Amino acid sequence: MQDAITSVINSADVQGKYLDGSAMDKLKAYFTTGALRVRAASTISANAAAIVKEAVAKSLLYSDVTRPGGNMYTTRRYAACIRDLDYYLRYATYAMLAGDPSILDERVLNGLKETYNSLGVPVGSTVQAIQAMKEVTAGLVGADAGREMGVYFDYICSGLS
Amino acid sequence: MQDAITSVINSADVQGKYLDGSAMDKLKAYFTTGALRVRAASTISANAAAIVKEAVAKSLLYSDVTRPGGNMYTTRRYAACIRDLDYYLRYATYAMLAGDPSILDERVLNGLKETYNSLGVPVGSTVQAIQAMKEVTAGLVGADAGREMGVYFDYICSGLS
Amino acid sequence: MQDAITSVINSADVQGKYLDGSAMDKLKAYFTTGALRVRAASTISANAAAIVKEAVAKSLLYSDVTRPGGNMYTTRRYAACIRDLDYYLRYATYAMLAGDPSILDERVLNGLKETYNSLGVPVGSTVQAIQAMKEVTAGLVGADAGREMGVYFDYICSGLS
Amino acid sequence: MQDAITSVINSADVQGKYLDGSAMDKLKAYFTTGALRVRAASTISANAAAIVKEAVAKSLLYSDVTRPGGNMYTTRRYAACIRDLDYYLRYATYAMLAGDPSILDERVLNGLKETYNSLGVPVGSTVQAIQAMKEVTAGLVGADAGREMGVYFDYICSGLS
Amino acid sequence: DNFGEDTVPFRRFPTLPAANFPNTERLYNQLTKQNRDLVVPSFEPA
Amino acid sequence: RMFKITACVPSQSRIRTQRELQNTYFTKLVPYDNWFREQQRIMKMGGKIVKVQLATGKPGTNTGL
Amino acid sequence: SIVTKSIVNADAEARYLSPGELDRIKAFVTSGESRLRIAETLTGSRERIIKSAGDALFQKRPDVVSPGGNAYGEEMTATCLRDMDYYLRLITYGVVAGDVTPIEEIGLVGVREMYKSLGTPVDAVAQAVREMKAVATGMMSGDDAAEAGAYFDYVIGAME
Amino acid sequence: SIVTKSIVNADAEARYLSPGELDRIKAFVTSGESRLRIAETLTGSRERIIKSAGDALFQKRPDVVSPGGNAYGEEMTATCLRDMDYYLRLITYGVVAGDVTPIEEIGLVGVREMYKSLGTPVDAVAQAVREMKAVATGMMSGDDAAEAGAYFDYVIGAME
Amino acid sequence: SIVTKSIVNADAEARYLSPGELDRIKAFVTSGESRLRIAETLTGSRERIIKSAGDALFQKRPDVVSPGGNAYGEEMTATCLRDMDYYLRLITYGVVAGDVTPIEEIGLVGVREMYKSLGTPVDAVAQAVREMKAVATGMMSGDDAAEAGAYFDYVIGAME
Amino acid sequence: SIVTKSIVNADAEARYLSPGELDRIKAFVTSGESRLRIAETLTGSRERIIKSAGDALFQKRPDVVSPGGNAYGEEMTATCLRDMDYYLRLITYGVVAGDVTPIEEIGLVGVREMYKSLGTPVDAVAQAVREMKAVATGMMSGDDAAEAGAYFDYVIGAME
Amino acid sequence: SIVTKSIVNADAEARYLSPGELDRIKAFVTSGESRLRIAETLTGSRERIIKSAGDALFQKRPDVVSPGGNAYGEEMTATCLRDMDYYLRLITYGVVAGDVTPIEEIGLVGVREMYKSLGTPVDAVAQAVREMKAVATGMMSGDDAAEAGAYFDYVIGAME
Numbered sequence A, B, C, D: 001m002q003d004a005i006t007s008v009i010n011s012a013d014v015q016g017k018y019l020d021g022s023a024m025d026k027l028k029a030y031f032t033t034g035a036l037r038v039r040a041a042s043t044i045s046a047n048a049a050a051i052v053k054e055a056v057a058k059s060l061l062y063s064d065v066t067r068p069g070g071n072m073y074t075t076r077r078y079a080a081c082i083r084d085l086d087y088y089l090r091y092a093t094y095a096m097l098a099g100d101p102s103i104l105d106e107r108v109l110n111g112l113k114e115t116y117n118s119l120g121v122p123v124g125s126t127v128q129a130i131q132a133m134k135e136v137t138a139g140l141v142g143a144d145a146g147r148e149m150g151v152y153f154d155y156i157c158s159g160l161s
Numbered sequence E: 001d002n003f004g005e006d007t008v009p010f011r012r013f014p015t016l017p018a019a020n021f022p023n024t025e026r027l028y029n030q031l032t033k034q035n036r037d038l039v040v041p042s043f044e045p046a
Numbered sequence F: 001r002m003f004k005i006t007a008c009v010p011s012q013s014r015i016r017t018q019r020e021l022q023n024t025y026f027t028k029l030v031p032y033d034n035w036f037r038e039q040q041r042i043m044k045m046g047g048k049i050v051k052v053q054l055a056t057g058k059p060g061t062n063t064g065l
Numbered sequence G, H, I, J, K: 001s002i003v004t005k006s007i008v009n010a011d012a013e014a015r016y017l018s019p020g021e022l023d024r025i026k027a028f029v030t031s032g033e034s035r036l037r038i039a040e041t042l043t044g045s046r047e048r049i050i051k052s053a054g055d056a057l058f059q060k061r062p063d064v065v066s067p068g069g070n071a072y073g074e075e076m077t078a079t080c081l082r083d084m085d086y087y088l089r090l091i092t093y094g095v096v097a098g099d100v101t102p103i104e105e106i107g108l109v110g111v112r113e114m115y116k117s118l119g120t121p122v123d124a125v126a127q128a129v130r131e132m133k134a135v136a137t138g139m140m141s142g143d144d145a146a147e148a149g150a151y152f153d154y155v156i157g158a159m160e
Ligand SMILES: *[C@H](C)[C@H]1/C(=C/c2[nH]c(/C=C3N=C(/C=C4\NC(=O)C(CC)=C4C)C(C)=C\3CCC(=O)O)c(CCC(=O)O)c2C)NC(=O)[C@@H]1C
Pocket: H064, H070, H071, H072, H076, H077, H079, H080, H081, H083, H084, H086, H087, H090, H106, H107, H118, H120, H121, H124, H125, H128
């Protein structure tokens, strides 16, 4: 679990030097992004349920998954699906606030692949749902923070695939 | 954990159809077997200790296992052996009653292989003991239910080997 | 967990015989060593903290490990290092008292290798620290018990490497 | 557990009324004193062990209670006494920050008299120790911060007596 | 030793520490927020 | 910081009449702070550890775990 | 079915099946024809049951068919009747199973969470299964209506 | 509040307040004046907030005011306006306290269980707080609207 | 031995060995010659002990040698004497160990379960080890007979 | 930083970040320039701070520089100043982090255990960081001196 | 003591005292005369032990008596010799009791916390007990010096 600040401190710590001016440059880059990161995080926290319901209504609803024969058929599997999507959105918001995708590699993509292979979850439908959620949150909170959420959603998809 | 009934309902549920006549055919097959399944289950439940003692007296007793140098030498290992055999017989009776070996794959053969590799338990002696128990219960409860117990004991041996 | 006595009883038990005269010979060998084993154990128990601090001051202190860039840099890693060394010395004292390195193979070297690979602990620095601790305890408690501690420290190093 | 803000809100809610001008004035009083509370809490967090050891050096040292027969005699009893005084200073800091002594009778003064009466702890000597702790910290943080610390120290001494 | 890795803990009815049974009974016989009192403060020395 | 541990633990004192495969063989995620005490407990059970693995760890990081 | 539930009960209690539950499985075996008849009559008249129950639900609770409500429009009302179809299907599965457990596995675990996601009022669904229960027990003979109404009653109990 | 949360979070950790938490309490102590100004803005114009938000809600979700709706029959709409007044009061409490522990610790813990026992759609309540947020942030300056919309945002987020 | 038990005691209590149990290990070390003499005399006369104890057991309890009993026939009586051989062997192991723990590990954990499986009456085995105890303490000198009778007494206590 | 701590707080409480701590992260974001200035001035004059603080410590507590003490000799005094360098470095890291957590992770967990191993008196180290605090706050402007003295105060509090 | 430890260790195990523990108590009961002789040797010459051990300690560790150390001044050196007198008294108690539960249960449990709260280097206290051990084992015969040095060894081991 590291921020932009903690990754800068960590990188300056492995080689063993003090804080140089380029580290201060990265830190001021993080701060001037971090103000709008805060406002986008509040907007996503306000509208998370509508974001997830628009994501599943965009991609997963009238397919074979939410139909019978898919892995989203029963109400147990539907509730697990909505919970999986809520967790993707929440951890993407954490990675957006920290400015580092180390949390997504640490807590989300740790053993998610093998349990998704073992339960038979389709990776492609999940990736489509996450990308639909990505442009839903991009149209919600704005353009630059939409790109911020975009690279972290893409990090989740790349760790998933 | 599924019966013949629950597997029929499950298969008709994945493809999404209602109950067809072939499902009713499988269900009536299950019932006309299930009456004698009940009587054989009562007979096995009545005589389980004699069945297990005849199984170990048939195969494991005067070998190197119950002797020194084997994995059945101490009283700790002997008690664990009798408990393992009792559990094989009990779960075979459950699979005979349900008409489905999903319980044997679910609770017996889940991690039994790797702990049998890790403790150094001989697989071949266990398989011989289970087959001896198989024809002991076949001579006890009868021919058709002997075949019923036979395919479930063989399922346990195939998951073990 | 076996002593010299329990290993003698175990070996006479696997083949199945009673106590022979050679077993009594090994037992009297264990006793005539065991008196000085007791006095050396009391001496090591009295001076364990000084032994460990002399071991780290001999080998690990002015290197890159206790410096930055090493695995012994932070106070968390230093405290873990001193705890690892204390545990090596304590288990070596237990193996010296029992007269058998089965405890070192049982409790120390069980999964210590793979966690030392996974955390990135240097094996060579640990081996140097253990050998420095070995001749520190040899100069402390004496020559013959120094050899006693020597083969058990060497057992720990051989299981580590 | 409630600060001045939560107690004001609880009074206005048990009334069922909105926040009138007297509640606004109480919250303005707390929001004026809060910066002084913060700075005094930092200054007290600076010198926890020094304030505790100066309180023992003023009251409890060189008296009968550290001599044989006293309740502060042994090293276990000395360590538990230092622990109890650190608790009193820490919770007085918490009650100073909240501006309400509800945490003191919720979490210090709840079963403290019965505990001290069952153990045989002298209540007058520990009241004098808390009074010397109050005197030392009022010498540390000044007049008015020392007074707003001493009101909760007097609360602890009154609930203990 | 008592519960294990897979078992939810449950109400034990212990014997051999002589304090342990009436303290356990006085603890579990109450409902939550029955009273603010601590059922044992401490044990008196011998 | 989470260790994937797999361990086969035999209980020699009691022949447990229930199935208890999870008490015997299990693979689980342990935090790093409690992994030391849990490894000591497993060694006191005497059970052999097939594999340990660490994937949340990021070793070598002095700051931010 | 009843056999899987008796097996997991004898498994958790680590014993063989008692002769009481062996007699229960035997009585279930003999009552298979009656439950086949009940599920047969329910699979026969599912459309009439669904149409009368949906119109009775819309007559009772007009909030769902109102503008701004959940089931507004042609496709939304059709999906409402599709969900009633799924629930009557699970009712027939539990009727032929002798147990409520396939209804639990397929359609009772997360219905509050998923209907919290879709925006469906769950008490309206409980009213829909209430109307389906009233109509199906109006169709059946009274003893078989009591049997099917036990499973319908279980579904509306797990709803609200 | 902020002071309660900092005290408790240092209290479990068996430590004093860290200096970062102390300048957090100091910054909240300095921003209390703007918090009290937002609270007077929300308090003094509660009539127009509740009236306009109820109007926009019943315009947006007419089925709850429609026959069969939970809020039916003048008192049901009017009764709802009291629940909206409760939530605006909790918004004012959370604005003053600097944290959402008044709002959560009073009117958000068992809100799902209560509104399920009353038969109320919780999404329509989220729309009511959404219209209250629209009228309230239409009533203030920019940073004041953001600081009040944070707590309005928390209430609508804790609904769903 | 006593050293493994003192080590696991100091391990569970997470401390070094106390000087009391260091003195216990030292006293065990000095008493090694006496226990070697006891185990020497027992390993000397094991056949005579087994023959007299088996005939005394068959004279006391004739149910095991009767038709229908457990130890009926030549091979069954020989296996009975073989089990008495194993128990006297474990008695010698525990006598030379200074502790009852190898007797526990090898032959005391599941003897009730395995003799429930074979059909052996366990109280008859307790009588057999009682006769072996009486004969072996009849052979030894009284102090060494007390030491060996402690381990024999432990075995018959763990039997019944 | 403050963001990792707010994230682990929202994680353990299993909710999103509150608008209070979003405003805390935003205020931390705006105060980045002031903390950059503080860490800039500290990284500028680290040698002068260390020299004056070490001579003040040796003037106050001469036991460490005495014969038989810990820091006796050229290399031992140089290592003492090296440890003061590490602690001022961690002070700058925590000053720029906005939180005391990197100081905790790198140099506050086992300092009592490791200085118990080396023989260093830990209260002397607390006096050394006290002198470093007094000198660094003597260098800074009073508001920035209060900020840096918060982290210095935390270090000497975790020492003693 | 030995009897307390044996009684408690049999007491948790729900058994009586094993015969090995009983001859342990018997051997301690016989060696009590030599224990009382060592106790009179340690008691009668306490003045010279404390004086010579304080002299050799302050010769060995002069920084704690130099200005800046803990035991600087008249009263502080008197309290230092008083603490050494306390530890010699506990040594005499542990010599009589045959075990270290008097020494540990009186003056070794929270010794680190107490001497950290006083500001005392614990290694210099270990050197004080080392010099006390040197003077005391220089005062006796061989086995008497070994038996007293066991308890002195336990005190210095429990320091570090
Ligand atoms: C409002 C826009 C929506 C709505 C409201 C509605 N509420 C009720 C009845 C009650 N509501 C409460 C709610 C609270 N009590 C609290 O203390 C708090 C926290 C401060 C809340 C939110 C309670 C206790 C009642 C019961 C009566 C009472 O006030 O004591 C009703 C009536 C329900 C009924 O069955 O009569 C309605 C209609 N309903 C809507 O449709 C709007 C979406």
